[PDB]
Amino acid sequence: SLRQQVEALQGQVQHLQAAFSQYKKVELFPNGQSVGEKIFKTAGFVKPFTEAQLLCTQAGGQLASPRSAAENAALQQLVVAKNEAAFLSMTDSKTEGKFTYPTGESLVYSNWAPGEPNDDGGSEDCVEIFTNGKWNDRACGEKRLVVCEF
Amino acid sequence: ASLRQQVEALQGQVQHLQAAFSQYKKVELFPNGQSVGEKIFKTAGFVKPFTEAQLLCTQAGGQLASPRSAAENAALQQLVVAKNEAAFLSMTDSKTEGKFTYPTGESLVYSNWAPGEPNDDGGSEDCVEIFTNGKWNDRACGEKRLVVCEF
Amino acid sequence: ASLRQQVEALQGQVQHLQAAFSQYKKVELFPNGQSVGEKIFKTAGFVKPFTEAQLLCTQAGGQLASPRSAAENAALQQLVVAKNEAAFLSMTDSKTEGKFTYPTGESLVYSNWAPGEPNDDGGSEDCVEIFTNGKWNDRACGEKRLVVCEF
């Protein structure tokens, strides 16, 4: 009887593994990107930093925070796809000139475009990623593509 | 020993599925879904007249948003606020004027009518819309409102 | 009997996961997807020329919509009707004019050509589009059509 039940359970699990794998592909198309254990997903629209940040946190995640070249490339795919620069999670709002993650830790990876960050006009504390994958500090009030990570 | 080994194996596979699925649930609901209790509201993102909206939800295996508690109503309101578009609820008093029911015919177990509503304005309001402030108003079924289904 | 209870526990978890997964699958398909058999069609919601559309589907781990039966075609038609935009199918006759094949080079096992099609108009129609009425027409691969992938 146990052997009978174990077999039924094995089949149920195998079915779920197959169904789940197909479902993951469906979910990620066309607004998501999986890289490592991280998943980037764009909302498809633009918002200023504070609004974008709240949407991500309320959804149980946070604004895109690429921590490696591999993550940045995955994120860049969505930006290129929507042809819209996106906001990253990092800012130097606390200490001008020092960009940090929402936790408060210092950047462990960066991909600044030449000359950036430059605090243009003395008011750029947020970061945007261009279609070429490079970063630029930009005013938090501007509207950029919303991309969260989970 | 084999059965034991088999069981332990299944344990690890199930743990992987649960963790992987837990992540995908969050990804899926962003930005058009809202989970509340065991119910999930999902907006189509566009507006349609009542009959069209209702068919979309039913064919999808669900039904139009039917908040049955203040918590469910507040969750649905979040989507309405996000899209900034009032949405249709599933309930109507099409059978018996003044008596609103769910698609199953059951009487309402919760309501959040704006003051003075429902008022059957113009003698022709049998459907219900929820505003960005979460309050309800009976409205003509021919009007176009945000489509939100529950699953 | 410790394995009996362990198996009992694991199954409850598995069945709860099955229920949650089923609910999330319905949510996922609303309103841009359609399930038919073991196949799932999902539209990106925008249009693109054939080559770009084909790349999007393959990079996503799938391929362009390839209806292989009347049932599959009807499901795909639902999405085309909903978006009110004709979509590209995966099949082409680029290798041998007049002979349409799936990306694998295999010959069609089902077709739903509109009357008079395929006609290779202008001597340059090697791709296929499906209309809101479900019928097919060969069309120039450079045209932009709704992107629908199958998984």
Ligand SMILES: OC[C@H]1O[C@H](O[C@H]2[C@H](O)[C@@H](O)[C@@H](O)O[C@@H]2CO)[C@H](O)[C@@H](O)[C@@H]1O
């Ligand atoms: O454009 C290629 C397409 O042309 C014809 O279809 C026309 C149709 O005749 C017009 O009435 C209108 O619907 O525009 C269509 C697209 O131009 C051919 O019938 C068709 O075979 C061909 O692919």
Ligand SMILES: OC[C@H]1O[C@H](O)[C@H](O)[C@@H](O)[C@@H]1O
């Ligand atoms: O307008 C704001 C932007 O202008 C230019 O692109 C500058 O190179 C950049 O640093 C700045 O953020």
Ligand SMILES: OC[C@H]1O[C@H](O)[C@H](O)[C@@H](O)[C@@H]1O
């Ligand atoms: O125009 C229709 C609506 O007009 C106003 O909002 C009334 O307060 C409301 O009761 C009615 O349904």
Ligand SMILES: [Ca+2]
């Ligand atoms: Ca500053």
Ligand SMILES: [Ca+2]
């Ligand atoms: Ca700054």
Ligand SMILES: [Ca+2]
């Ligand atoms: Ca700058």
Ligand SMILES: [Ca+2]
């Ligand atoms: Ca009436």
Ligand SMILES: [Ca+2]
């Ligand atoms: Ca009425």
Ligand SMILES: [Ca+2]
């Ligand atoms: Ca009213």
Ligand SMILES: [Ca+2]
């Ligand atoms: Ca040809």
Ligand SMILES: [Ca+2]
């Ligand atoms: Ca041809």
Ligand SMILES: [Ca+2]
């Ligand atoms: Ca033709």
